[PDB]
Write a protein that binds this ligand. Structure first.
Ligand SMILES: *[C@@H]1O[C@H](CO)[C@@H](O[C@@H]2O[C@H](CO)[C@@H](O)[C@H](O)[C@H]2NC(C)=O)[C@H](O)[C@H]1NC(C)=O
Ligand SMILES: *[C@@H]1O[C@H](CO)[C@@H](O[C@@H]2O[C@H](CO)[C@@H](O)[C@H](O)[C@H]2NC(C)=O)[C@H](O)[C@H]1NC(C)=O
Ligand SMILES: *[C@@H]1O[C@H](CO)[C@@H](O[C@@H]2O[C@H](CO)[C@@H](O)[C@H](O)[C@H]2NC(C)=O)[C@H](O)[C@H]1NC(C)=O
Ligand SMILES: *[C@@H]1O[C@H](CO)[C@@H](O[C@@H]2O[C@H](CO)[C@@H](O)[C@H](O)[C@H]2NC(C)=O)[C@H](O)[C@H]1NC(C)=O
Ligand SMILES: *[C@@H]1O[C@H](CO)[C@@H](O[C@@H]2O[C@H](CO)[C@@H](O)[C@H](O)[C@H]2NC(C)=O)[C@H](O)[C@H]1NC(C)=O
Ligand SMILES: *[C@@H]1O[C@H](CO)[C@@H](O[C@@H]2O[C@H](CO)[C@@H](O)[C@H](O)[C@H]2NC(C)=O)[C@H](O)[C@H]1NC(C)=O
Ligand SMILES: *[C@@H]1O[C@H](CO)[C@@H](O[C@@H]2O[C@H](CO)[C@@H](O)[C@H](O)[C@H]2NC(C)=O)[C@H](O)[C@H]1NC(C)=O
Ligand SMILES: *[C@@H]1O[C@H](CO)[C@@H](O)[C@H](O)[C@H]1NC(C)=O
Ligand SMILES: *[C@@H]1O[C@H](CO)[C@@H](O)[C@H](O)[C@H]1NC(C)=O
Ligand SMILES: *[C@@H]1O[C@H](CO)[C@@H](O)[C@H](O)[C@H]1NC(C)=O
Lengths: 416, 86, 198, 49, 49
């Protein structure tokens, strides 16, 4: 058998987009502009613009719904105590700083800085951008409230009223959740705190150095930009007509036979708008799927402890921290990783007094001379007794059973 | 949308695409927000849950007398009595 | 365009995953791989579903025989029934179908005199051949746009399926899952991965 | 109450698609073939491909 | 893409619709992959990320 003898606290970063830019379009300016004749001709092509406006409004409300479901998950707004001491844990890099006017953590400020006349030109073509319903300040307040709740109460506030508990006790509970006894933490508190602080500093430095971690979010923004660019380029295409300017067509051609070019231009512009709307719908569906995944991760990893493998970061998940980023969320997963493994000799059961003994939760190991029982996730040998082992059957059906003795706690003092 | 509340077209007799339905000023007050210029509603210093989302943290609702606008409230403030051994 | 990852690389990944699961259990998915005898891993998994180790410790032979019989039955069922892999096959068929359509639209007049274009140019003067070519290119561009939209929708569906498959791989192969019916019907014990065309 | 007295080890199969065939389209010779004269009409339509 | 390295443009003056960016073939380590023909890269026997 192989059993680890040391542990390491690790911190990982995972970025998920939540919402995209809300956009609106105007038919009159983009398709016609300022010419009344074009609109008068457009009036009898149906209600395509109504469908486009309805779809855009649906996307706009869907973005706000996604943001609200992702972030607005707590009824109360918890406040951190003025005394910032948690038994050696720092949490300085994630707690809000009142000195800065933006009321954001250093990690949040770095995230904002790492993420980045054309606006007026796009507005002049009827393409406008609606501001988000929720401002960054309220998102920061939600993140701060979530952090305060998960620090001062653990997972108790995710199922009802918030219940206070010392942070070392909460981390002992978290270790007990993954099958590690509490005395492991209670004998290595300082080392665990130092490792956590070092990991937090390493994450801070890594996020400061390389800016390619958030490219995903940037990519999404880039996509939106290029989409708009394409639409602008669609205003420079004749689609096989004589010119892209209405006044020249109306002046250089006799109007009874000049209607064909105008109709061709209208059809081309409507087709381009429909293609853009379809692409926006597909992108919005993908963003909604990502937002649902992010909301599920927020509900599970942050508000509780998840036993799912690799769901909340590599290794044995311990806890998580949420942070906000421009059009996205960042999860800092704190997990547990074994290390410094050692070889040992193991047997399925112990034969004593013609009976087979099996461990309750531990595993039997041997160092070449003696036999002990130890927990499966950490090396802690103990003398085999009757309290941690149970008897089931005899020694003639079990394969690989070995011979040893089991100490009886009550027999020594019985005689004296 | 996109008006600084001062360039609002007051019109003379007919210079707008709007078919003469403009409310000028000082009747229902003027509010300036990031989304645009809002008229017909009176801003208040209180805070309630969002009913009609306007944008940029501004919402509107009809009380029982008129339509008013305010800033949405995130929730009720709460505090946890953290301690060394409690 | 040929795929970036060859079939040999996928087979090597599958073999590595199988060897890791066999010789280490779930310890290799959460850190360094630690060796463990297979009967002890089976006992741990039995403890996972609330069954004590003594049940396995005097039924190991019967359980091994049952597992061998079950895997043989699975092999025979895969060999006999050919309608089990349709979930993949139709997918490929769909692509071919789309391709066929994207070819067949080339033989449609789209309201013009003929599908062939050079005969249109040589038949008469440009003042009407231009209109015919305009109609043809508009129809072909509409067909291309429709094909692209269908491909995008199918790609989104395939991405959703791949995300589900990756989640199932992470939660069923690299460990024991307590979710009901997620990793099979009944009390889940452990899973084995295998590759297949797409 | 009903208490089980025996067990069965079962094996089930699950098939899941992963990847789709990657394709590329050449607009130039699909839209007009090898005829050079037809190619001149595309330029007035912009970057449609 | 999908072109055998044997029929790459050798040319006398012009035999290709591309705007004549022809480079030396033999001295540029022309290599053949299942994806087609690669010019300008020297294949090595090592392996990295
Ligand atoms: C388990 O690992 C920790 C750190 O991962 C070890 O603690 C370090 O021990 C070295 C030994 O001299 C010191 O220099 C360091 O200051 C200690 N702390 C850190 C954060 O590195 C610990 O000794 C290891 N224990 C075993 C049994 O291997
Ligand atoms: C938590 O971490 C911060 C680093 O972000 C520590 O702040 C630094 O502390 C050192 C003391 O060794 C000073 O020299 C630096 O100037 C501090 N930097 C900043 C930006 O404040 C902080 O001390 C840590 N918390 C505790 C309790 O030690
Ligand atoms: C296996 O572990 C046992 C633990 O008891 C070792 O036995 C002890 O060894 C120390 C020397 O390190 C002696 O001082 C004790 O008197 C021994 N106690 C008993 C009860 O034997 C044993 O030496 C270890 N064997 C190996 C090969 O490491
Ligand atoms: C553990 O102890 C038992 C009892 O001392 C051993 O069983 C004996 O085995 C020998 C030969 O292996 C027989 O001749 C005896 O009749 C057995 N005695 C009983 C009471 O069954 C057993 O072999 C020991 N285990 C090992 C691995 O040697
Ligand atoms: C447990 O003790 C804490 C602190 O001793 C109590 O929290 C205080 O409650 C009073 C209510 O009269 C408030 O005025 C204080 O502001 C609270 N303190 C803090 C730091 O918030 C708490 O009420 C006690 N629990 C119960 C059930 O009474
Ligand atoms: C018990 O609480 C006290 C204060 O609540 C802790 O003492 C220090 O208090 C100051 C506030 O003036 C903090 O800045 C320090 O971080 C606290 N700790 C230390 C070591 O100075 C005291 O540490 C707490 N004790 C325990 C065991 O939690
Ligand atoms: C539990 O079921 C297994 C098989 O499902 C039983 O094993 C069978 O036992 C009979 C009689 O001993 C044999 O004829 C069969 O060949 C066995 N099956 C196999 C696959 O070998 C077992 O007896 C059952 N146990 C109980 C307590 O009913
Ligand atoms: C255990 O032994 C094997 C072979 O004897 C060796 O390869 C392996 O590194 C050993 N493990 C440890 C932790 O020493
Ligand atoms: C609105 O006008 C005021 C007064 O000149 C000016 O300070 C402010 O910047 C203007 N805002 C915008 C958005 O134009
Ligand atoms: C490419 O050229 C080589 C050498 O002339 C020849 O053997 C091969 O059949 C050709 N075709 C392919 C697909 O490799």
């Amino acid at each position: 058998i192989a059993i680890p003898t040391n542990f390491t606290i690790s911190v990982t970063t995972e970025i998920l987009p939540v919402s995209m830019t809300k956009t609106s379009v105007d038919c009159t300016m983009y398709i016609c502009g300022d010419s009344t004749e074009c609109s008068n001709l457009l009036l009898q092509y149906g209600s395509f613009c109504t469908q486009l406006k309805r779809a855009l409004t649906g996307i706009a409300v869907e973005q706000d719904k996604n943001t609200q479901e992702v972030f607005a998950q707590v009824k109360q707004i918890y406040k951190t105590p003025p005394i910032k001491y948690f038994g050696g844990f720092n949490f300085s890099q994630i707690l809000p700083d009142p000195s800065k006017p933006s009321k954001r953590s250093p990690i949040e400020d770095l995230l904002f800085n790492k993420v980045t006349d054309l606006i007026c030109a796009q507005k002049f073509k009827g393409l406008t951008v609606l501001p988000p319903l929720l401002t960054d300040e309220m998102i920061a307040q939600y993140t701060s409230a979530l952090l305060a709740g998960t620090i001062t109460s653990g997972w108790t506030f995710g199922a009802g009223p918030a219940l206070q508990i010392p942070f070392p006790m909460q981390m002992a509970y978290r270790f007990n959740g993954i099958g590690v006894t509490q005395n492991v933490l209670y004998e290595n508190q300082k080392l665990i705190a130092n490792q956590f602080n070092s990991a937090i500093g390493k994450i801070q430095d890594s996020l400061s150095s390389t800016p390619s971690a958030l490219g995903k979010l940037q990519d999404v923004v880039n996509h939106n930009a290029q989409a708009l660019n394409t639409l602008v380029k669609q205003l420079s295409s004749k689609f096989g007509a004589i010119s892209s300017v209405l006044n020249d067509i109306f002046s250089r051609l006799d109007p009874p036979e000049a209607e064909v070019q105008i109709d061709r231009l209208i059809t081309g512009r409507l087709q381009s708008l429909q293609t853009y709307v379809t692409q926006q719908l597909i992108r919005a569906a993908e963003i909604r799927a990502s937002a649902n995944l992010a909301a599920t991760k927020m509900s599970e990893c942050v508000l509780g402890q998840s036993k799912r493998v690799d769901f909340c970061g590599k290794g044995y998940h311990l806890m998580s921290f949420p942070q906000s980023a421009p059009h996205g969320v960042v999860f800092l997963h704190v997990t547990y990783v074994p290390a410094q493994e050692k070889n040992f000799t193991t047997a399925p059961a112990i034969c004593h007094d013609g009976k087979a003994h099996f461990p309750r939760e531990g595993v039997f190991v041997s160092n070449g001379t003696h036999w002990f029982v130890t927990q499966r996730n950490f090396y802690e040998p103990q003398i085999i007794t009757t309290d941690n082992t149970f008897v089931s059957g005899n020694c003639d059906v079990v394969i690989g059973i070995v011979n040893n003795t089991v100490y009886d706690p009550l027999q020594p003092e019985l005689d004296s | 949308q996109g008006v600084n509340c001062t360039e609002v077209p007051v019109a003379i007799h007919a210079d707008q695409l709007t078919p003469t339905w403009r409310v000028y000023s000082t009747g229902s007050n003027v509010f300036q927000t990031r989304a645009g210029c809002l008229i017909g509603a009176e801003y208040v210093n209180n805070s309630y849950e969002c009913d009609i989302p306007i944008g940029a943290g501004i919402c509107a609702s009809y009380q029982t007398q008129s339509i008013i606008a305010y800033t949405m409230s995130l929730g009720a403030e709460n505090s946890v009595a953290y301690s060394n051994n409690s």
